[PDB]
Amino acid sequence: GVVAAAEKTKQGGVLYVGSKTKEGVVHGVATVAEKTKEQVTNVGGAVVTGVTAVAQKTVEGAGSIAAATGFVK
Amino acid sequence: GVVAAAEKTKQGGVLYVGSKTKEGVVHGVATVAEKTKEQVTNVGGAVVTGVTAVAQKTVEGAGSIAAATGFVK
Amino acid sequence: GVVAAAEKTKQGGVLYVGSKTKEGVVHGVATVAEKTKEQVTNVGGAVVTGVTAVAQKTVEGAGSIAAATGFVK
Amino acid sequence: GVVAAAEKTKQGGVLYVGSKTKEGVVHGVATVAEKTKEQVTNVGGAVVTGVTAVAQKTVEGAGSIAAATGFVK
Amino acid sequence: GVVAAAEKTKQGGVLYVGSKTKEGVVHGVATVAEKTKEQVTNVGGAVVTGVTAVAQKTVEGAGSIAAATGFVK
Amino acid sequence: GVVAAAEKTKQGGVLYVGSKTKEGVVHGVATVAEKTKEQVTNVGGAVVTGVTAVAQKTVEGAGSIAAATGFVK
Amino acid sequence: GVVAAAEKTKQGGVLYVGSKTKEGVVHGVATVAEKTKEQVTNVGGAVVTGVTAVAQKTVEGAGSIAAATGFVK
Amino acid sequence: GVVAAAEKTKQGGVLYVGSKTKEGVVHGVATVAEKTKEQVTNVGGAVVTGVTAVAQKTVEGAGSIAAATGFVK
Amino acid sequence: GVVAAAEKTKQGGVLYVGSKTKEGVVHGVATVAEKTKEQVTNVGGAVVTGVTAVAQKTVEGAGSIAAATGFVK
Amino acid sequence: GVVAAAEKTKQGGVLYVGSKTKEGVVHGVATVAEKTKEQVTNVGGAVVTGVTAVAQKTVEGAGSIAAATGFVK
């Protein structure tokens, strides 16, 4: 039983980023592999992957990830 | 049983990013592989992958990911 | 049983991004592979993949992903 | 049983992006593969893949993805 | 049983994008493959794939995707 | 005085190339340019530009090239 | 005075190349440039630019190249 | 005075190359430049630029190159 | 006076190369530059630039190169 | 006076190379530069630049190179 559950129940500044760059090489979430069996990537949140990466008020509610990998059994 | 469930029940500034760049190479969520069996990528959230990547108020409710990979059984 | 369920029940600033770039190469969610069996990509959220990628108020309700991969059984 | 269910029941700023770019190459959700068996891509959300990719208020309700891949059984 | 169900029951700013670009090459959701068996792409949401890709208020209700691929049985 | 002069006065094996290729992209003598004034290409000899390029006993006599480029004077 | 002169006065084995290739990209004599004034390419000899490039007994007599470039004077 | 002169006056084995390759990228004589004034390439000899480049008995007589570049004077 | 002169006056084994390669990237004579004035490349000899580059008995007579670059005077 | 002169006057084994390689990246004669004035490359001899580079009996006669660079005078 691989169960994920999420509930969100609502009974309802300045951010300056000045970037000046030359030759920007960016890798974010990388999985490099040879001779694998499983390559699982779950993103319940945020992956902000700029050369200028700004993430404001981003992952702000009720996230659930349930990963079951392998299980030769 | 691979179950994902999500509920969202609602009973209802300045962000400056100035980027100046030359030669921007960006990789976000990469899975590079040789001789795999499974390559799973679930995105219940956000993958913001610019050279200028801004993510404001992004992943803000009730996300569920249920991944079951492999299971030779 | 691979079940995903999502419910959303509603009983109801400034963001400046100035980008100036030369030679922008961007990869977002990449799965590169040789000799796989499965290549699954579920996007219940957002994949914003510019050279200038802005994502405002994006993934804001009731997402569910249920992936079951492999299962040689 | 591969079931996906989604319900949405409703009982009912400034975003400037100024981009100036030369030589923009963009890849979004890529699955590159040799000798696969399955290549599944489900998009219940948004894939915004510009050179200037803006996604405002985008994935805002009741998404469900249920993927079952493989199952040699 | 590969079932998808969706219900939507309704009992009922400024976004400037100024893009100036030369040589824009854009790939969105790509599945490139040699020697596959299945290549499935379901889009229950949005795939906005410009050189200038804007997606405002886009994927805003009751989406369901149920994919069952493979199943050698 | 841009002078070229050539005189040729005559008082008068096995070469196996087995090529097997897929996806061959070949560029030979390329001059790629933006905002030039002169683009001169003189070929007094041989430019053999195959995917399988064999040149046997090719440039075997009395070649002269006299190039004068620019000369703002 | 840009002078080239060439005179050729004549008072008169096994080469196996077995190539097996996939994805061959070949560039030979390339001049890539932005904001030039002169782009001169003289070939008095041989430019053999295959994926399989064989040049046997090729540039075998009396070649002359006289290049005068620029000369703001 | 930019003078080139060449005279050739004639008073008159096994080479096995077995190549097996995947993903061959080859650059030979490259001049890559931004904001130049002169880009001169003289080839009085041989440029053999394969993925399998064999050059047998190639540049075997009387070559002359006379390059005069610049000369602001 | 930029003079080149060449004279060639004639009063007249086994080489096995077995190459097996994957992912071969080859650069030969490269001149990469930003903000130059002159980019001169004279080849009176041989530039053999394979992934498998064999050069047998190649540059075997009477080569002359006379380069005069710059000369602000 | 930039003079080059060459004269060649003629009054007239086993070499096994077994190479097996994966991921070969080769750079030969490279001149990488930012803010130059002159970039001169004279090749009166041989530049053999394989992943498997064999040069047998190659530069075997009468080569002359006369380079004069700069000379602000």
Question: In the structure, do chain C and chain H come into contact, i.e. share 3 or more CB pairs under 8 Å?
Answer: no
Strand blocks (E) in chain G: 2-10, 14-34, 38-43, 46-48, 52-56, 63-70
Secondary element (H or E) of residue H57: none
Give the E-state strand segments of chain H in sequence order: 2-10, 14-34, 38-43, 46-48, 52-56, 63-70
Residue D59 DSSP symbol: B
**Chain J residues within 8 A of H45 when measuring between CB atoms:** 43
Q: Residue H67, Cα to own-chain centre: how many angstroms? A: 14
Are the Cβ atoms of F70 and H38 closer than 8 angstroms?
Answer: yes
Q: What is the DSSP string of I9-53?
A: EE---EEEEEEEEEEEEEEEEEEEEES-SEEEEEESSEEE--SEE
Phi and psi at residue G47, to the nearest 5°: -125, 100
Taking CA D1 as the corner, what is the angle to CA C69 and CA D3, rounded to the nearest 5 degrees? 90
Taking CB atoms and an 8 Å cut-off, how many pairs form between chains F and H? 8
Token look-up 């075998």 returns: G60
* Three-class SS state of C62: coil
**How close does chain E come to D53, measured CA to CA in Å?**
5
What residues of chain H lie within 8 A of the CB of G33, using their CB? 31-34, 36, 39
CA-based nearest distance H38→chain F, Å: 9
Q: Which residues of B touch D46 (CB under 8 A)?
A: none
The three-state secondary structure class of F65 is strand
Experimentally, how was this structure solved?
cryo-EM
- Is there a contact between B29 and A22 if contact means CB atoms under 8 Å apart? no
On chain C, the residues whose CB falls within 8 A of the CB of B3 are 1-5, 66
Out of C14, C37, C51, the one facing D36 most closely (by C-beta) is C37
* Chains F+D touching (3+ CB pairs under 8 Å): no
G58: closest CA among D54, I24, H44, B69? H44
Cα angle H6, H7, H10 (rounded to 5 degrees) comes to 150
Which distant-in-sequence residues (6+ apart) come within 8 Å of C45 by Cβ?
A43, B43, B44, B45, B46, B47, B59, B63, C58, C59, C63, D45, D46, D59
Please tell me the distance in Å from C58's CA to the nearest CA on chain A: 9
Q: Identify whether the C-beta of residue G10 lies closer than 8 Å to the C-beta of residue F72.
A: no
Contacts of F39 (CB under 8 A, 6+ apart): F31, F33, G39
Give the count of beta carbons closer than 10 Å to the beta carbon of residue E70: 22
Identify the CA nearest to H3 among candidates I42, I5, F5: I5
Query: Across the beta sheet with E2-10, what order do the strands follow?
Result: A2-10, B2-10, C2-10, D2-10, E2-10
Closest Cα in chain D, distance from residue C71 (Å): 5
Residues of F44-64 as b/e, b for ≥16 C-beta within 10 angstroms?
bbbbbbbbbbbbeebbbbbbb
Work out the end-to-end distance of chain J between its first and last CA atoms, rounded to an integer number of angstroms.
Answer: 14
Report the 10 Å Cβ neighbour count for J73: 9
End-to-end CA distance of chain D: 14
CA H45 to CA G43: how far, in whole Å?
8
Question: CA C34, CA C28: separation in Å to the nearest integer?
Answer: 19
Rounding to the nearest 10 degrees, give the CA dihedral for residues B47, D66, B60, A11.
Answer: 180
Closest to J53 (Cα-Cα) out of A3, F47, I54? I54
CA neighbor of A64 nearest in space, from C59, B45, B9 = B45
> Which residue, among C31, C21, C9, has the nearest Cα to C52 in the 3D structure?
C21
Among partner residues C22, C34, C38, which is closest to B37 by beta-carbon distance?
C38
Q: State the Cα–Cα distance between residues I45 and I61, nearest whole angstrom.
A: 9
Give the residue carrying structure tokens 């795999």. B36
Question: What is the identity of the amino acid at C61?
Answer: G
Test C50 with D51 for CB contact under 8 angstroms: yes
For residue A10, count other CB atoms closer than 10 A to its CB: 12
**Strands J2-10 vs H52-56: parallel, antiparallel or unpaired:** unpaired
Q: Which residues of A touch B17 (CB under 8 A)?
A: 17, 19, 52, 54
Half-sphere exposure of I41 (CA within 13 A, CB side): 30
CB D62 within 8 A of CB E60: no
* Residue B63 to residue C2: CA distance in whole angstroms: 17
What are the b/e assignments for J21-44, b being 16+ CB within 10 Å? eeebebebbebebeebbbbbbbbb
J and G in touch (3+ CB pairs within 8 angstroms): no
> Strand J52-56's sheet: what is its strand order?
F52-56, G52-56, H52-56, I52-56, J52-56
Is the C-alpha dihedral spanning G1, G7, G13, G15 positive or negative? Answer: positive
CA angle H24, H27, H29 (to 5 degrees): 155
Other CB atoms within 10 A of residue G37 CB: 20
Window 5-64 of C: residues touching A by CB (8 A cutoff) are 19, 31, 33, 45, 53
Cβ neighbours of E10 (radius 10 Å): 11
Can you tell me the distance from the alpha carbon of B50 to that of C52, in angstroms, rounded to the nearest whole number? 5
Yes or no, beta carbons of A30 and B33 under 8 Å apart? no
CB contact at 8 A, E65 and D45:
no
Q: How many CB atoms lie within 10 A of CB C53?
A: 41
* Radius of gyration of chain I measured on its C-alpha atoms: 18
Extract the tokens encoding B59.
């992943």
> CA of B8 to nearest chain D CA: how many angstroms apart?
8
Mutate to test the interface with I, among J14, J23, J35, J36 (most CBs of I within 10 A): J36
Q: Which residues, 6+ apart, have CB-to-CB distance to J9 below 8 Å?
A: I7, I8, I9, I10, I11
First to last CA, chain G: 14
Whether B16 sits inside 8 A of A17 (CB atoms) is yes
Q: Letter for the amino acid at F28?
A: G
- Looking at beta carbons, which residues of chain A come within 8 Å of C65? 42
Chain G residue with the nearest C-alpha to that of I21: G21
Chain E contact probe: residue of C2, C26, C72 with most E CBs at under 10 A: C2
Backbone angles phi, psi at J44, to 5 degrees: -90, -15
- Write a three-state SS string for chain F: CEEEEEEEEECCCEEEEEEEEEEEEEEEEEEEEECCCEEEEEECCEEECCCEEEEECCECCCEEEEEEEECCC
DSSP summary character for residue J57: S
- The DSSP result for chain J, as a single string, is -EEEEEEEEE---EEEEEEEEEEEEEEEEEEEEES-SEEEEEESSEEE--SEEEEES-B-S-EEEEEEEE---
Tally I–J CB contacts below 8 A.
336
Q: In the numeric block, which tokens belong to residue D17?
A: 């992006």
Q: Do G30 and H33 touch (CB under 8 A)?
A: no
Chain I residues near residue H32 by CB distance under 8 angstroms: 30-33
CB C28 within 8 A of CB A28: no
Instruction: Give the chain F residue whose CA is nearest to the CA of G30.
Output: F30
Residues of H in contact with J2 (CB under 8 A): 68
Sequence-distant (≥ 6) Cβ neighbours of residue I22 within 8 angstroms:
H21, H22, H23, J21, J22, J23
Q: Is H56 annotated as a binding residue?
A: no
> Token pair of D49, please?
């893949």
- Across-strand partners of E36? none
User: Which residues of F are known binding-site members?
Assistant: 27
To the nearest whole angstrom, how far is the Cα of H48 from the nearest Cα of chain G? Answer: 5
CB I12 within 8 A of CB H13: no
Pairwise CA distance, residues B65 & E22, whole Å = 39
The angstrom resolution of this structure is 3.0
* β-bridge partners, A20: B20
Q: Which helix (H) or strand (E) holds J35?
A: none
Q: DSSP secondary-structure letter at E62?
A: -
Are D18 and C17 a contacting pair, CB within 8 Å? Answer: yes
Around Cβ C31, how many Cβ atoms within 10 Å? 28
Chain centroid, CA I29 distance in Å: 8
> Closest by alpha carbon to C18, among D54, B50, E54, D17?
D17
Cβ A44 vs Cβ A65: under 8 Å = yes
**CB contact at 8 A, C4 and A5:** no
- The full length of chain G comes to 73
Q: Give the pairing of strands D63-70 and E63-70.
A: parallel
Q: How far off is chain I from H60, nearest CA to CA, in Å? A: 5
- Per the CB < 8 A criterion, the answer to whether A49 and D27 are in contact is no
Residue identified by tokens 């794939």 is E49
Cα torsion H63, J55, F48, G49: sign:
negative
Pair of tokens at residue C23: 């030679």
CA-to-CA dists, residue B51 to E25, E26, H4, angstroms:
15, 14, 52
Q: Which one-letter amino acid corresponds to residue G38? A: E
Contact by Cβ (8 Å): B44, C65: yes
Name every chain C residue with its beta carbon within 8 A of the beta carbon of A5: none
The closest of J5, J15, G46, D38 to H28, measured between CA atoms, is G46
Q: How far is G18 from chain F (nearest CA, A)?
A: 5
